[PDB]
Design a protein around this ligand. Structure first.
Ligand SMILES: [Zn+2]
Ligand SMILES: [Zn+2]
Lengths: 232, 201, 214, 113, 168, 213
């Protein structure tokens, strides 16, 4: 079973659309659960109107203007934000573009509020969606906030690198960018063993004082392989 | 006018050019003295414009080769601009002879915000010479026709093909035959010439 | 000469068109009255410098010697123009009344840019008589003149009540034509009137179709 | 343009007018810092030609996927050059060759207009 | 004749190398309405095509009134000029989406090519005859046919819908 | 190289079903760290502490899609890993791509990358201008394919790495009858290997209209 993952793509979006260009990156843990949630680093304002940059996060209703995503990350001052996006103080064009964006977030001046506008109860959840949902590859650990930030920076960069005619729109069919048998059993087994896992949890939740039905991993496997329907 | 080569062009350019298509760049400098500039290559252009406001400036650097293509004139260009805004925007400009075409101007509570919204309103809501009609090529077609002597003979005639569609308007233009015009957009034809003509299409 | 030299050249073509429509509608008009060159036109409806005053263009016309033969009661028509590039509900009563008394039956105002929503909301307020509205920029070129536009024709409630018997039609079974149809307006149709279309055909030479106006 | 930030709280700089004295100021809306104008130029739009030379590390003579021409730079007079076309991905660009020399790292073209 | 043709491709090859030199110098003007680049193709294409066109035509008149294939063409019972051509002379230029074999690999046709090679031996021109394609030629050719097979497997039922509608 | 151009079902699903060439193989899944480590100890100054201006044209490096810091002069970091694979100390299955034209270093361990094998060229001839493999290795064929690889005579090139190499067709070369024929890093084992099971039985597939094959 054959679009690769964990990679940056930039697409131009038709004349009829509030969005100009957008960059995406499909992410999933190469080993461990494997979430299928993608990152959207949009770029509103068509090639005219008086041009902000907002991005989409997993589980968040609306979209957030990149500046905040940074302060909410661990970078609170301007120019230290432009620090990550642009790598050449003498590239006024790009920087210019960013300007209007900075103004967007000029209203939130720190990490407190940063993680807030994302709706004590609410602030705590803000963190979560950043350590386990936001660009979840790289790692979902904790003390790496910095790293993801340079990415979201390398991303907001890739966006503009095109909206300024320096790099073309990503070639959707560049073959360089196959789950054989062995792998298949994997994603399959897990789905199974995991129902066995929380099955063995019930026998342990009745004994007010053997049980493991090793048939879910035998019969489960058979069903699939027999017909051709992977999923349970 | 049938095989009138230049007559073809003369209509082409009469059928959408915008300020946006002749402007190489635009800048907004800070010049508080309405009687001299902080810019060199502009000096002359002031003094030679006082014989036969806001301190905030807005300069436009138009293209030379671009003024010969769609053909335009500083006199016109500006003339248009000026009458677009009118009495609440003083504007000036150099003369076609120079080696750098320019257009300065000022307004008449936070101006750096206003003189920027008027940046766009200048590059996208202002026409110089209609709409929906981009590229317009010319072609020499085969048109059979009645020689005076009877027999039908080869009399090719120029024709303008468009790359967009508006009819009600590009029809009443001096130099066309509103008896032969034709858009493949039947939808239109019916709306303009009566369901019948529509069917025909 | 500036760019006003052309705003005349057009008001003129728009004129001749009106005429043609008026004679085709079924009224009197000389081919000449249509062929008034641009030259001999200027000096006739202009003031001083070189501007045309429309308040002096409007006119009347009437049912030809013939028109009275097929259509009896076809009343008299009146075409009007106006110098107010935005005419409204007030300068309206001047029109709405001018005919409700003279007693014509056909009103035809030529609004330059647009009439007011308060205004035109007073048209179907004077029956039997009926009134029409035509934008200027839409009469610059007579549409009937077009290549694709085949010749249409009205039909007395006699020529109609005939087609129906002759073909055994139930009215609805007849090809229709829109009230707001470019040609339908031009000949000023009404909901219930029929129209014979006669066009060239690469199969027989001439075919005869009919459209009733819904 | 090449705009500026500010010491103290490294931020964006917004401009304001020196009414009474007639001259330009730049500032901050987080603290109070304020500096005079560096240049009378404030904003530019510019409706390219920069980026054709695209990152040419000396190692650009180690990318085997590049062509070999035996000319001779306008300076060192060598005979081992590599080339390409503008990296400006514009359907309307032109096709002139830029050359790098294994004996210098110059940027000579083939153009002639 | 098999020789007279070879050199109708060589010369045709240079009438390309020539306009490529004259393009890699900006020594050509933009035919109104077309991009400087597009106008480059527009000629390369019109060069190889006219080349190929006579390449075959040399053999066409080189096949006597006894050549069976010719016979089966005159009778009108199978095949045409084109066919003979692609079998005895030059197969032709390959193509997808209307343009000679793209640059799927950054700035090249196959990894077996030097970057920025705009020539015909790279863009998919099979100079060989079936009687005698090179990998490159053979590949492009496939990418070209592949487009063909595509719609013969798409237009097949969408055409049927459009049909069905007209009926109902 | 990776997929057969001809064998693929007509109608319906056509091109959505591909068959493998003879030489193609799929990656399996190696480990990252024995290479992450092997790196940040050979020139890889970790991302954690980065300074964009002190390190200008710093060639950034990626591992399986993660950014593990940059590196100063890479030219060598490159022709060291490549020497490491050829001795067989970083699985012949891993992919390493250097994109000078952008200053980056691609590292792939991944499971599911189709790759083919090629002869290595290396201008390693202090006696001329040449395939590392020689007619002595050949006639020598306790000498499997595992040795042809443990001696750096052949390499496993995935589609990505392919991008930055130059492959020579006929090893040798690179009559009025035959077909007219028109920096190298690798040579093609044999062009007739770009075919898969299907075409492999077709005689002179290089003489028929492709759609027939
Ligand atoms: Zn400050
Ligand atoms: Zn040199």
């Amino acid at each position: 079973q054959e679009s690769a993952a964990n990679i940056v793509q930039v697409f131009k979006k038709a004349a009829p659309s509030p969005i100009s260009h957008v960059a995406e990156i499909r992410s999933a843990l190469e080993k461990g659960s494997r979430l299928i949630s993608t990152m959207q680093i949009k770029l509103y304002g068509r090639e005219d109107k008086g041009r902000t940059i907002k991005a989409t996060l997993p589980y968040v209703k609306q979209d957030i203007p990149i500046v905040i995503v940074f302060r909410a990350l661990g970078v609170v001052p301007d120019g230290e934000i432009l620090q990550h996006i642009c790598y050449d103080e003498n590239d006024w064009q790009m920087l210019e573009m960013l300007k209007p964006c900075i103004e967007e977030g000029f209203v939130i001046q720190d990490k407190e509020v940063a993680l807030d506008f994302i709706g004590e109860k609410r602030i705590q959840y803000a963190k979560d969606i950043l350590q386990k949902e936001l660009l979840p590859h790289i790692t979902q650990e904790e003390g790496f906030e910095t790293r993801k930030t340079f990415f979201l920076g390398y991303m907001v960069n890739r966006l503009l690198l095109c909206a300024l005619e320096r790099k073309d729109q990503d070639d959707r069919d560049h073959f360089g960018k196959l789950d054989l048998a062995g792998p298949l059993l994997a994603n399959l087994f897990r789905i199974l063993f995991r129902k066995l896992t929380r099955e063995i949890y019930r026998y342990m939740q009745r004994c007010i004082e053997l049980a493991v039905k090793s048939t879910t991993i035998t019969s489960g496997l058979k069903y699939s392989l027999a017909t051709g329907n992977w999923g349970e | 006018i049938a095989l009138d080569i230049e007559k073809a062009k003369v209509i082409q350019s009469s059928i959408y050019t915008t300020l946006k298509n002749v402007t190489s760049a635009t800048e907004i400098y800070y010049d508080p003295d309405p009687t001299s500039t902080v810019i060199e290559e502009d000096f002359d252009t002031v003094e030679a414009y006082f014989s036969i406001q806001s301190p905030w400036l807005l300069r436009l650097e138009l293209d030379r080769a671009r003024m010969l293509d769609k053909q335009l004139t500083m006199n016109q260009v500006a003339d248009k601009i000026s009458e677009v805004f009118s009495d609440d925007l003083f504007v000036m400009w150099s003369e076609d002879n120079a080696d750098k075409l320019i257009i300065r101007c000022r307004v008449i509570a936070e101006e750096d915000q206003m003189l920027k919204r008027i940046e766009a309103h200048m590059l996208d809501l202002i026409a110089l010479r209609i709409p929906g009609i981009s590229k317009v090529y010319m072609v020499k077609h085969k048109v059979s026709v009645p020689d005076e002597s009877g027999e039908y003979k080869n009399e090719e005639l120029w024709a303008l093909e468009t790359d967009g569609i508006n009819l009600a308007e590009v029809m009443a233009v001096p130099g066309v035959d509103s008896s032969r015009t034709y858009s493949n957009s039947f939808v239109e034809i019916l709306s303009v010439l009566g369901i019948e003509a529509t069917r025909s299409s | 000469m500036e760019d006003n030299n052309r705003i005349i050249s057009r008001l003129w073509r728009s004129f001749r068109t009106v005429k043609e429509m008026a004679a085709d509608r079924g009224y009197f008009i000389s081919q000449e009255e249509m062929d008034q060159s641009l030259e001999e036109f200027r000096s006739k409806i202009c003031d001083s410098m070189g501007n045309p005053q429309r308040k002096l263009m409007s006119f009347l016309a009437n049912p030809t010697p013939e028109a009275l033969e097929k259509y009896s009661d076809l009343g008299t028509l009146w075409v009007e123009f106006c110098d107010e590039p935005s005419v409204g509900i007030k300068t309206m009563r001047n029109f709405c009344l001018r005919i409700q008394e003279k007693n014509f039956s056909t009103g035809i105002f030529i609004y330059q840019n647009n009439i007011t929503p308060s205004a035109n909301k007073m048209i179907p307020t004077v029956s039997p008589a009926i009134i029409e509205t035509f934008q200027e920029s839409d009469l610059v070129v007579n549409i009937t003149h077009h290549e694709l536009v085949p010749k249409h024709i009205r039909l007395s409630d006699g020529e109609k009540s005939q087609l129906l018997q002759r073909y055994k039609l139930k009215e609805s079974q007849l090809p229709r034509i829109q009230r707001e149809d470019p040609v339908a307006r031009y000949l000023g149709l009404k909901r219930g009137q029929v129209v014979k279309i006669i066009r060239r055909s690469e199969t027989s030479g001439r075919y005869a179709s009919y459209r009733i106006c819904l | 343009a090449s705009f500026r930030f500010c010491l103290e709280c490294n931020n964006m700089l917004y401009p304001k007018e020196d009414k009474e004295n007639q001259r330009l100021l730049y500032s901050c809306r987080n603290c109070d810092y304020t500096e005079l104008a560096e240049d009378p130029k404030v904003y530019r739009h510019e409706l390219t030609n920069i980026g054709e030379t695209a990152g040419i590390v000396d190692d650009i003579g180690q990318d085997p996927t590049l062509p070999r021409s035996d000319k001779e730079c306008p300076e060192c007079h060598s005979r081992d050059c590599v080339f390409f076309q503008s990296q400006q991905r514009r359907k309307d660009t032109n096709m002139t060759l830029f050359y790098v020399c294994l004996n210098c790292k110059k940027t000579f073209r083939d153009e002639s207009e | 004749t098999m020789k007279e043709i070879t050199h109708a491709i060589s010369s045709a090859k240079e009438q390309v190398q020539e306009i490529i030199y004259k393009a890699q110098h900006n020594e050509l003007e933009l035919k109104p309405g077309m991009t400087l680049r597009e106008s480059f193709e527009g000629e390369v294409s019109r060069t190889l095509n006219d080349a190929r066109d006579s390449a075959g035509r040399s053999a066409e008149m080189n096949l006597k009134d006894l050549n069976n294939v010719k016979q089966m063409v005159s009778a009108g019972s199978k095949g045409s000029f084109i066919n003979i051509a692609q079998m005895s002379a030059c197969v032709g230029q390959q193509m997808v989406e209307g343009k000679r074999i793209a640059f799927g690999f950054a700035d090249r046709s196959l990894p077996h090519f030097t970057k920025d090679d705009f020539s015909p031996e790279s863009k998919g021109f099979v100079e060989n005859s079936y009687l005698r394609l090179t990998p490159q030629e053979f590949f492009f050719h496939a990418m070209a046919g592949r487009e063909g097979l595509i719609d013969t497997a798409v237009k097949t039922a969408e055409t049927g819908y459009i049909q069905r509608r007209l009926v109902k | 190289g990776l997929v057969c151009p001809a064998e693929t079902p007509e109608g319906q699903a056509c091109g959505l079903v591909k068959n493998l060439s003879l030489l193609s193989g799929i990656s399996i899944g190696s480990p990252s760290e024995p290479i992450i480590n092997f790196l940040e100890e050979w020139g890889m100054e970790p991302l954690e502490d980065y300074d964009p201006a002190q390190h200008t044209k710093s060639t950034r490096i990626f591992v399986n899609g993660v950014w593990t810091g940059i590196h100063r002069d890479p030219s060598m970091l490159v022709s060291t890993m490549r020497d490491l694979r050829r001795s067989g100390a970083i699985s012949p299955e891993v992919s390493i791509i250097r994109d000078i034209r952008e200053r980056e270093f691609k590292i792939f361990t991944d499971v599911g990358r189709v790759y083919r094998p090629l002869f290595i060229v290396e201008d390693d001839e202090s006696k001329d201008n040449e395939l590392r493999i020689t007619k002595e290795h050949i006639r020598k064929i306790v000498y499997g394919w595992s040795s042809l690889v443990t001696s750096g005579v052949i390499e496993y090139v995935d589609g990505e790495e392919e991008e930055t190499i130059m492959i020579a067709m006929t090893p040798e070369d690179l009559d009025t009858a035959k077909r007219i024929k028109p920096t190298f890093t690798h040579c093609e084992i044999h062009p007739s290997m770009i075919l898969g099971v299907a075409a492999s039985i077709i005689p002179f597939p290089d003489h028929n209209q492709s759609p027939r094959n």
